[PDB]
Design an enzyme around this catalytic site. Structure first.
Site, PDB file in Angstrom:
ATOM      1  N   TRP A 139      36.320  -0.737 -59.466  1.00 33.27           N
ATOM      2  CA  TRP A 139      35.773  -2.070 -59.478  1.00 33.27           C
ATOM      3  C   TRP A 139      36.098  -2.690 -60.859  1.00 33.27           C
ATOM      4  O   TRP A 139      35.554  -2.293 -61.908  1.00 33.27           O
ATOM      5  CB  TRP A 139      34.254  -2.033 -59.185  1.00 33.27           C
ATOM      6  CG  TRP A 139      33.616  -3.396 -59.254  1.00 33.27           C
ATOM      7  CD1 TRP A 139      34.116  -4.549 -58.711  1.00 33.27           C
ATOM      8  CD2 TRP A 139      32.440  -3.779 -59.974  1.00 33.27           C
ATOM      9  NE1 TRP A 139      33.308  -5.616 -59.012  1.00 33.27           N
ATOM     10  CE2 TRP A 139      32.253  -5.167 -59.766  1.00 33.27           C
ATOM     11  CE3 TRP A 139      31.507  -3.091 -60.741  1.00 33.27           C
ATOM     12  CZ2 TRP A 139      31.160  -5.860 -60.308  1.00 33.27           C
ATOM     13  CZ3 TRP A 139      30.426  -3.772 -61.286  1.00 33.27           C
ATOM     14  CH2 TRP A 139      30.258  -5.147 -61.072  1.00 33.27           C
ATOM     15  N   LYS A 183      22.902  -5.273 -51.719  1.00 29.83           N
ATOM     16  CA  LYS A 183      23.663  -5.140 -50.517  1.00 29.83           C
ATOM     17  C   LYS A 183      22.851  -4.581 -49.365  1.00 29.83           C
ATOM     18  O   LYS A 183      23.066  -4.934 -48.208  1.00 29.83           O
ATOM     19  CB  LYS A 183      24.952  -4.381 -50.796  1.00 29.83           C
ATOM     20  CG  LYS A 183      26.144  -5.313 -51.062  1.00 29.83           C
ATOM     21  CD  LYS A 183      26.559  -5.418 -52.535  1.00 29.83           C
ATOM     22  CE  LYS A 183      27.754  -6.336 -52.751  1.00 29.83           C
ATOM     23  NZ  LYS A 183      29.038  -5.610 -52.757  1.00 29.83           N
ATOM     24  N   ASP A 191      27.346   4.965 -60.507  1.00 29.68           N
ATOM     25  CA  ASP A 191      27.262   3.577 -60.037  1.00 29.68           C
ATOM     26  C   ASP A 191      26.896   3.619 -58.529  1.00 29.68           C
ATOM     27  O   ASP A 191      27.805   3.817 -57.715  1.00 29.68           O
ATOM     28  CB  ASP A 191      28.642   2.890 -60.098  1.00 29.68           C
ATOM     29  CG  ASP A 191      28.579   1.377 -59.993  1.00 29.68           C
ATOM     30  OD1 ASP A 191      27.576   0.746 -59.744  1.00 29.68           O
ATOM     31  OD2 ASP A 191      29.716   0.791 -60.222  1.00 29.68           O
TER      32      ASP A 191
HETATM   33  C1  LIG Z   1      30.728  -0.860 -57.149  1.00 34.24           C
HETATM   34  C2  LIG Z   1      29.931  -2.076 -57.572  1.00 34.24           C
HETATM   35  N1  LIG Z   1      29.012  -1.926 -58.556  1.00 34.24           N
HETATM   36  C3  LIG Z   1      28.253  -2.926 -59.031  1.00 34.24           C
HETATM   37  C4  LIG Z   1      28.438  -4.172 -58.516  1.00 34.24           C
HETATM   38  C5  LIG Z   1      27.660  -5.391 -59.036  1.00 34.24           C
HETATM   39  O1  LIG Z   1      26.474  -5.358 -58.324  1.00 34.24           O
HETATM   40  P1  LIG Z   1      25.342  -6.388 -58.594  1.00 34.24           P
HETATM   41  O2  LIG Z   1      24.144  -5.716 -58.071  1.00 34.24           O
HETATM   42  O3  LIG Z   1      25.369  -6.699 -60.016  1.00 34.24           O
HETATM   43  O4  LIG Z   1      25.780  -7.651 -57.794  1.00 34.24           O
HETATM   44  C6  LIG Z   1      29.351  -4.433 -57.504  1.00 34.24           C
HETATM   45  C7  LIG Z   1      29.481  -5.759 -57.020  1.00 34.24           C
HETATM   46  N2  LIG Z   1      30.729  -5.854 -56.225  1.00 34.24           N
HETATM   47  C8  LIG Z   1      30.915  -6.983 -55.269  1.00 34.24           C
HETATM   48  C9  LIG Z   1      30.330  -8.273 -55.804  1.00 34.24           C
HETATM   49  C10 LIG Z   1      30.807  -8.693 -57.179  1.00 34.24           C
HETATM   50  C11 LIG Z   1      29.889  -9.150 -58.123  1.00 34.24           C
HETATM   51  C12 LIG Z   1      30.280  -9.581 -59.394  1.00 34.24           C
HETATM   52  C13 LIG Z   1      31.633  -9.589 -59.736  1.00 34.24           C
HETATM   53  O5  LIG Z   1      32.063 -10.015 -60.979  1.00 34.24           O
HETATM   54  C14 LIG Z   1      32.569  -9.170 -58.793  1.00 34.24           C
HETATM   55  C15 LIG Z   1      32.157  -8.736 -57.532  1.00 34.24           C
HETATM   56  C16 LIG Z   1      32.363  -7.115 -54.999  1.00 34.24           C
HETATM   57  O6  LIG Z   1      32.827  -8.278 -54.854  1.00 34.24           O
HETATM   58  O7  LIG Z   1      33.066  -6.067 -54.947  1.00 34.24           O
HETATM   59  C17 LIG Z   1      30.104  -3.382 -57.039  1.00 34.24           C
HETATM   60  O8  LIG Z   1      31.033  -3.543 -56.075  1.00 34.24           O
END
Ligand SMILES: Cc1ncc(COP(=O)(O)O)c(CN[C@@H](Cc2ccc(O)cc2)C(=O)O)c1O
Ligand SMILES: Cc1ncc(COP(=O)(O)O)c(CN[C@@H](Cc2ccc(O)cc2)C(=O)O)c1O
EC number: 2.6.1.1
Lengths: 396, 396
Positions: free
Chosen positions: A130, A246, A211
């Site tokens: 990520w 989620k 994570d």
């Molecule tokens: C693996 C993973 N870990 C943490 C987070 C962030 O989670 P939050 O609880 O802080 O929203 C994600 C989030 N991934 C999603 C959403 C996302 C959110 C912020 C940014 O900058 C990018 C994506 C995704 O789109 O994959 C994880 O996936």
């Protein structure tokens, strides 16, 4: 002062949103960001949550500052949900938890704690990973190095290549593991492979940071915590950055937790105190709403009962949209054999499309996937399938 | 890993809460943390708040991720309340605004942005100042120097030591001002004294950074933004860390803002991409409830109207608690003449008490002030007035 400042480059994921939100084309599909959708193409608010929110509405008498560590009860809950019914981690009082702004904020908290209070210089993160993992860590000064994971040629976990990579990590290093539903591959190590890394990493002298932003979308609650649960048994120390965005649909309210585990309570206490200070110089205290929802629910049998079913429901429609996805591909004129897609768990699918494919799917058909070729199954519906599968099929 | 971690000494303000909480003596009073209280001594939830919450209850269809910068409305609205309806700033599109986890998080977002993109090296912050300004800025790896501000002897703003101690401010330094309602003194520079600083800072090449966390408790909304608005005329560049925690009683949902001023649209633009970037590495996106509650109320004439009165009413009851305090003080013993109190703005009062004085009220009478000897006017009530005024008197 700002005459020289340079334009940064957008969030590869979140930035896609903007893009999406801007095309004026009709049939635009959005398999971008990980958002759970329903049959009818929308991002509902779960029922157990509106019920929770109503409760709050008629019951809240104040907006009083929360402690730096948030709502205690929300912590107890995260723990039980993390470790188990009467784990010794809990019985020993070996864990301290802090409610934070999302799982993205439990990270940032962790890494400001590590760098300020530890001798940590490096964090190893899977490849792929990520994209924010790095920026988070980098921001706290930490160095981010990558370990092998994903067998392209055969869509798996290349264990030995993984193991061989991590044989380069010094003790005192921090190793970063996704609890379940790897983002963005969707492949996760068996209970034995977790039992393995578990023994290894203990001997090797690594600090494991988990994570966990998807408890519930792999096999379910209690069973998606196995890896983590194997680790805990072994380790005296560890850290978990958990998210409820989620599995509770609470995306924009920011609900997560940072769990810290030491050899004992005297320690953990001392250690936790420093964590707080990390918070206090960041945002101070966490937002109430969203987390109060979570505890309310997790505390009430009825509401829980309801939420759990909402969850298994979300999960099942995903498992459904995946079978459906290949089938139609197949039935639609697809070169490759995509059946490895049914071997991936969680909201995604590591598609296999090139950068130039994903780029064309978009400019040319209005489809929206991350450039890695990451596709959001949860964004798939019987009403978009065909058209979706046709564009892909044309670009292959 | 955590075996040698040094426990940290608790937050000087929040830490007080803990103690209050665990204290068990019946008559305990708490003049510590800056929370508004009512006649009956409760920290009630505003009517305009409950109202907007209801509205959200019924109308919320999703919890979808907000943008990195939050709810556009919320911003559009903040600048208005900041600069004023017609302002060039707005018309010149020179301001950008990001919704944040409180005034704290904006501070931190400011720090991490400066640090990372400016070559700013040191931040100047008053004496006294609010104890977190330091911790925040340090953690971003910035130098904290103090300017002089308060004239003990006649309890006032020594413009002289002010001007002289800032002579060592360097060009490119960052000067930090409380827009109104000085915590913890309660003394503010005049529009004139403001007009002057604005003149210097320009002339001497400083980056002013306003800490606005009480707009509305001094004189009123537009009145309290004078200093700021004076600055806005002169300056080309400006940073503003705003918080809604007190003027909307939203303490625990973390609502505040960070506003970036530049010479032009293009600039602020570039410069804001950078800010966002800094946001993405911290908490990702802001929490929705609280902020949504603010845009709601500020975009609706009616609820607005209801708001502006609850505020006006909070102020009025405070001013009443002031003049009653000294009155009961004198009328009860008091050697000193606390009459300077009535000349302070906001929830607090720089009492003039001793470290060893506040240690004793607390230990011997259940009273709870900060160590600096900062007391919350707002935590004062007709019912408690006597008993407090008695202990304070017995420790003089
Ligand atoms: C693996 C993973 N870990 C943490 C987070 C962030 O989670 P939050 O609880 O802080 O929203 C994600 C989030 N991934 C999603 C959403 C996302 C959110 C912020 C940014 O900058 C990018 C994506 C995704 O789109 O994959 C994880 O996936
Ligand atoms: C002077 C000052 N500036 C900013 C803020 C930000 O508060 P937010 O809740 O909007 O982030 C405050 C708030 N200070 C209060 C309460 C408080 C908050 C945090 C900590 O660590 C301690 C106290 C106070 O009593 O000063 C300011 O005061």
């Amino acid at each position: 002062m700002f005459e020289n400042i340079t334009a940064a480059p957008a969030d590869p994921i979140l930035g896609l949103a903007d893009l999406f939100r801007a095309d004026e084309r009709p049939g635009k599909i959005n398999l971008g960001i990980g958002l759970y959708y329903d049959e009818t193409g929308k991002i509902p608010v779960l029922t157990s949550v509106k019920k929770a929110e109503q409760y709050l509405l008629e019951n809240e008498t104040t907006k009083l500052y929360l402690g730096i560590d948030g709502i205690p009860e929300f912590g107890r809950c995260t723990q039980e949900l993390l470790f188990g019914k009467g784990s010794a981690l809990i019985n020993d009082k070996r864990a301290r938890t802090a409610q934070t702004p999302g799982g993205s904020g439990a990270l940032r908290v962790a890494a400001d704690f590590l760098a300020k209070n530890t001798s940590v210089k490096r964090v190893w993160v899977s490849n792929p990973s990520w994209p924010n993992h790095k920026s988070v860590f980098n921001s706290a000064g930490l160095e981010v190095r990558e370990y092998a994971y994903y067998d392209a040629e055969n869509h798996t976990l290349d264990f030995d290549a993984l193991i061989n990579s991590l044989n380069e990590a010094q003790a005192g290093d921090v190793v970063l593991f996704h609890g379940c539903c790897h983002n963005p591959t969707g492949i996760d190590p068996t209970l034995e492979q977790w039992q393995t890394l578990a023994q290894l990493s203990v001997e090797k002298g690594w600090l494991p940071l988990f994570d966990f932003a998807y408890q519930g979308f792999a096999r379910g609650l209690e069973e998606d915590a196995e890896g983590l649960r194997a680790f805990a048994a072994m380790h005296k120390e560890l850290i978990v950055a958990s998210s409820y965005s989620k599995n509770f649909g609470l995306y924009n309210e920011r609900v997560g937790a940072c769990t810290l585990v030491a050899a004992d309570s005297e320690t953990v206490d001392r250690a936790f105190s420093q964590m707080k200070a990390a918070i206090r110089a960041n945002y101070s205290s966490p937002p109430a709403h969203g987390a109060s929802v979570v505890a309310t629910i997790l505390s009430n049998d009825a509401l829980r009962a309801i939420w759990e079913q909402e969850l298994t429901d979300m999960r099942q429609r995903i498992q459904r949209m995946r079978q459906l996805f290949v089938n139609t591909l197949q039935e639609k004129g697809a070169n490759r054999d995509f059946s490895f897609i049914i071997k991936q768990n969680g909201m995604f699918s590591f598609s296999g499309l090139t950068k130039e494919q994903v780029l064309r799917l978009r400019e040319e058909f209005g489809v929206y996937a991350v450039a890695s070729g990451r596709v959001n199954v949860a964004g798939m519906t019987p009403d978009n399938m065909a058209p979706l599968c046709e564009a892909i099929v044309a670009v292959l």
